[PDB]
Design a protein that fits this description.
part of a larger assembly; 15 chains; A mainly beta (106); H little secondary structure (88); I mainly beta (124); A: 106 residues; mainly beta; 7-stranded mixed beta sheet; 0% helix; H: 88 residues
Chain lengths: 106, 106, 106, 106, 106, 106, 106, 88, 124, 124, 124, 124, 124, 124, 124
Amino acid sequence: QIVMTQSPATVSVSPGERATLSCRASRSVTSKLAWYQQKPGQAPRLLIYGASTRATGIPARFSGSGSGTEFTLTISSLQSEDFAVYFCQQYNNGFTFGPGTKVDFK
Amino acid sequence: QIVMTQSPATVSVSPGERATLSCRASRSVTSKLAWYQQKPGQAPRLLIYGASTRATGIPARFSGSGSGTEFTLTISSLQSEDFAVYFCQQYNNGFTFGPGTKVDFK
Amino acid sequence: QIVMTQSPATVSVSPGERATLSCRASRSVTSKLAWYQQKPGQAPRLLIYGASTRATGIPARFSGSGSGTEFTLTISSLQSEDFAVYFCQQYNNGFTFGPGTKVDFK
Amino acid sequence: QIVMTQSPATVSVSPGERATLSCRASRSVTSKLAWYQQKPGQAPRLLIYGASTRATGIPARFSGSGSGTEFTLTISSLQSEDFAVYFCQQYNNGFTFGPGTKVDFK
Amino acid sequence: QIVMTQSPATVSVSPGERATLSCRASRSVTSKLAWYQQKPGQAPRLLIYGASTRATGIPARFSGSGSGTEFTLTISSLQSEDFAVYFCQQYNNGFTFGPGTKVDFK
Amino acid sequence: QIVMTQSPATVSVSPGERATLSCRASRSVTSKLAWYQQKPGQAPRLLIYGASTRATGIPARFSGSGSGTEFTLTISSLQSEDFAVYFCQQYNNGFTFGPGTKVDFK
Amino acid sequence: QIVMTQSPATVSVSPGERATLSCRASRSVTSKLAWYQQKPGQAPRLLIYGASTRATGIPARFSGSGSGTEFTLTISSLQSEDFAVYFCQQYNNGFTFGPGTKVDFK
Amino acid sequence: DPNANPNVDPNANPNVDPNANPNVDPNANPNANPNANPNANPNANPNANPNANPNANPNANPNANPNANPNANPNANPNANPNANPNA
Amino acid sequence: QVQLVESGGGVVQPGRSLRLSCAASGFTFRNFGMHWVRQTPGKGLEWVAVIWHDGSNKFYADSVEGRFTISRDNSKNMIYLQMNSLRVEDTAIYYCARDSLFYDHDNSGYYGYWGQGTLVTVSS
Amino acid sequence: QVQLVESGGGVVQPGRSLRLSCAASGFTFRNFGMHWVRQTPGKGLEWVAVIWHDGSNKFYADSVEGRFTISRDNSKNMIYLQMNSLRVEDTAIYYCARDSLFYDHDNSGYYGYWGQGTLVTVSS
Amino acid sequence: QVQLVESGGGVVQPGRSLRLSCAASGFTFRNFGMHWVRQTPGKGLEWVAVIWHDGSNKFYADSVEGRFTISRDNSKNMIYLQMNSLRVEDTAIYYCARDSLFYDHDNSGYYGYWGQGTLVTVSS
Amino acid sequence: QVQLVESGGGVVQPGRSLRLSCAASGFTFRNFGMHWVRQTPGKGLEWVAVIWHDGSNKFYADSVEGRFTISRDNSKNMIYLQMNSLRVEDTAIYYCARDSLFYDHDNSGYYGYWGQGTLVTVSS
Amino acid sequence: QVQLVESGGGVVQPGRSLRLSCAASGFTFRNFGMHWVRQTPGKGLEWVAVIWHDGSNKFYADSVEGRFTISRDNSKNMIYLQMNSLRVEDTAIYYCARDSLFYDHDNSGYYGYWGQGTLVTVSS
Amino acid sequence: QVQLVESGGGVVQPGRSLRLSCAASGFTFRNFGMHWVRQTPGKGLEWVAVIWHDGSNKFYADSVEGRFTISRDNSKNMIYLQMNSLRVEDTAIYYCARDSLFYDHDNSGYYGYWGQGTLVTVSS
Amino acid sequence: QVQLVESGGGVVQPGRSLRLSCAASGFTFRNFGMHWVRQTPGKGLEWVAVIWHDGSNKFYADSVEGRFTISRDNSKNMIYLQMNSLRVEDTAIYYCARDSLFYDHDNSGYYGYWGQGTLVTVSS
């Protein structure tokens, strides 16, 4: 179906700065793309659904954008409790996930 | 868009005499130009469309011609009911009308 | 839309001779033009569709050709049952027919 | 609808050599063209779907490509099991197959 | 693409006088050239577009003219609010701007 | 338009000797002149194009020269396969051929 | 089409002096002539395009000039990495390359 | 002649010559030009065209498309619709 | 065996209402769009109306625009034409036609199969 | 018999909202695009807005861009024009005009059939 | 393991009726649309018919339009093909084929999984 | 391998029409303009017609102006020549000739590749 | 058969406008340039206007400069002559003439084919 | 009242990515194409990118080719500019500009209506 | 950062077919026309083929006309070159070259950006 690719695989940053996470799909997905955050040890948590809408309880720090084949996830001032691996899903054609990208201490 | 000018503003003609009307465009219009007839207190009526094609129900008395920036409306034998103000429209680039030329009794 | 003309109105060919019919369109038609054969008291029969493609059951005797505004229908060697009136249709813009060309004995 | 053609009818390739098959369309079929492999006494097997995507379980040896009206199928290093007749299908407009190209010993 | 230059760099004119701003293109731009006015801290404002046509709301004081590679912008009786930096843009081939010309008090 | 003449009508030469053919134009054709070779039952073949440039696959045996109204074709050492009728064409104004010069055995 | 020749085949200069390479076309190419530099084992690099315009990133040392049928490529004060083969291309009519010129240590 | 006048003569006729041939030249090159610009044009009009035909096109194919996807759609909503009519 | 039969013809006065019915058999009815073709002697063949496969869209000729209503009943394999405000100029033989011999996306609008036709005359 | 009846006219104050309605009958409404045309004495006829057959595309004149909103509803054969932020320059007779006499692919943009028109006056 | 087996083959006279069956297993039968493919020696593979997942739409080739009928029973995982007015040129091997390897909206109509085929011969 | 094969020749009577066809292969057909060349014994070769790469411009000789019509189809690589109102002067061999060996802007109008020729005779 | 037919003649009053049309057939219209020639009895033949093949350039005589407008449409194969502000000196017969019998680069400007002519007279 | 406001400005380090957004109101957003214009002190105004009305085509300047990406959302009336791989040369003020005052087919590519602009600085 | 990488190279026998593919990244692929350029030792640099931005026009060199075929897929950012009927004269390094540094209407056809090149050897 549609193959998702994330770049870069890992990003190095210190708390307090802005982190950008990119998701790209082979074919057009319109505006149906969800972001998930998974910490080591427990299930991923739905951060963003649609293309930019935020799940109830998610802080405004998590910002999503993009449509079609280019998608990005931006965190305004990246904090410590939220260091984890982030997954990109498309639910327009089938149900596929991205390989996942990691945010790490610098 | 396209500035539409008609000349002369008013033509003096008697019944049975052939009356002519001129329409000029600022830029090229090709063959997309319609002529409308408006009688006092009435909505305009489509006489000619394209450059010379006649609307259904329009007497063969009305004859239009021209292309580019020179369009003319010719009435072969103007009768008593043919006294009104005639408008020139182009639909090649936008939708602009002319000021209108009125035919009156001589 | 498009006014469809055929010439000549009547063709006279002896059996075994080749009969050619012409069809002309006011504007460009490209490759959307069909030929129909109507016998007295019968419904028209589709011979050619597109510009040259032959309907199933039509013998290879009938050969249509042409594109744009010039279309020709060629009967290579006409037999006795090929005496009828042939109509020319364009379906590129609207659905207009031709007046019809009659094939008669010589 | 769309007539499928393949050339050459037969290709002679010894084991270990690269074999190429061709499929040509009368009108453009975009990128909807599947390749099948049929061994004598057996049903055809789907090798390639789309224009280049490979069916699951198909060795990476089979590499197809092409779009529009020119399609090719390439066997990188033909083995003994790759001797069969290969059919070309288009599913962009209708469902039409090709005549089939046979691969035999040299 | 096309390199745009302006002359002179600065003009000194008292209010009520006529100020002329010139513009030159490296290659012919036909009649596709616009003029913009920018006040300190404000976004540029489109005064004249194409070669001479005036944007809605622009006073008749501003007069643009020229064609080919020689363009001029003439301010007949410059008021107090007409002191700013004026930009010359061509859009015939690409989208390039001039260096800008500043109008200053005399 | 321009009439094309060749002289002499027939040239008799034995194999191994140099044979020269001449072509003359009523009006100047500058350097736009092509030479063709026709054998009985065969279509003409382009030998020289322009004034001297030689077509691909043509041996260096054939040598042409001249400009304006006087043109010559020279066969340095005529072989057995060079016995044919040679035509002279000018494409500067219209497309006119010469009568043709025949080369035969001695 | 147009045949391009470069003279001399090789030019010997020590680093620090001035090196000039000449390119000549059979027919006029106006001002459409690009220069390329190819190092051993590397792809050609565009130095100068048009007739004199310099590609982005090219140092001002490489100076192009000429128009019509006589072109020159001038190197102001040659470094050590400028030892390579330089090709001359015309793109006015077709796409043809020159034989290439070698610059070598003296 | 090296001493010929190199400057342009301003006394040349500035009017268009009506005796120029009005017939179109058959000797123009009939081959496609490979030297034309192959790059897309950024100077094209990015705005929409109101002059496009607003009327419905009767020449569209009225036959049912067999190339439509026959497989069931897994992306349909699996949740029970609350907007279904709750009355009798 | 594509068979098309027409009914509902006869004689009517000008300004009255007539309804033509077309029964189609020998093919999958719901997969194709149907037409109505009018043959006036001295004028030739003339198109009247067209209906989509499921009746989604309906397009009429200018001469019959606003007076004629075309419909279809895919469960009964029937094509209908409602003739309201009938006039003298509408006297002709009306042919029930099927669009295309087979589905081609780039080729549609020609009538592969015609009915025998029914005669509708308008006079006093 | 293509008949267009405008409504919703009257007198309003500048800066207020007025909604015009256009009722169409005598033709297949959903197959054609409809226009709004403005007539001010001393200036002549002026185009206002156009809507596609399905309502997908809407275009407006410069003088009415962002203030006038055209809409259509094919189930009631009605054409609407919502006029917000009205100014003294907007007083005129507004005509409901259908595009084209019949469907011609290469000829569209002329008003074959006009409505009776309604008067919108803006003042205090 | 998607296994498709055809049945109902044999020898029949021209003009008679034959009914083929195809049993499907190893996948969710009701989520996919099944086809029929015909292989005549000397002509190659040719498409016959297609049915939607729920049986809503049925399409047939022009050579078999009006004579062949494709049907399905999702409660028995069976695909049927009723062959009426059978003729001599319909003698071939019939393959029961499934559309697509998996669900892709923009890619459908190719036969990922074929049955072993059944032989139908029509002669006197 | 530029191969040109003509067809459509035969016998005609004066005042009738014949249509010649030319099949082209071995090169990009749509990038080149094609000619027609006629060879009459006792007269030699003489040019007949030429068409542009996209068929925009068509030029005919004096003796065939108004009677011969040249056409081309870039989707089928075919060159046509409609010959209406034939005369006994038109009896000759017609060659399908491609313009130029390769694209040169200043050198065009010579026949790089010829076909084998077809015979058209006009007699009773 | 190069056949040229003028039309639109008649009698008008001085200071009015008249239009002449010329329908050309029997040759490729868009390949040649046309003229208008005026024949006044007692004065002879005098030239009026010329137009290029594609309508690019237009040249008029001194006596009719600025009052007469020549135009053409290659699609309907017609030549038009718009005569504004006619005067008594403009009474004559107007001929539709074609330039040259065939294309020659160095020889153009002579009328190889004439129309039958139309009479235009102005008076009170 | 067309108001264009932008956001997404701030300070970013070289080699990082920034996203600018531009909100459009007061006009039909989907009928026009929007540009991004760059202003740097000491260099003047500079063009960056353009997008079509429906987002079909996107053209970027040479200095930003392959690093910047323009996109639009006609449902939210917003314009976006993704700026990856930022370099020190990109310090400027970025304006959201609309193409043309109104639709003129032969005149487009000038920025009639601008926004206030946002400041993007790249430094350590 | 514009990178062009070629693949599909290797050694083939004369008369066989090879397919070269070129991957493009770092720019808007669909806005530029791509070239194939050939380098044979002892002969110099040589041009092979060109394709328009959307693949509408394709032009090949004389030496490769009729045998090679260039194509592109704007959805995969890849350039292909089908080399049918290869000969010993085709042994060279094949480069993937992009036309022009940026868009200039009057300056195009020069190879701003080149790939690393792939080697194709034809021998036995």
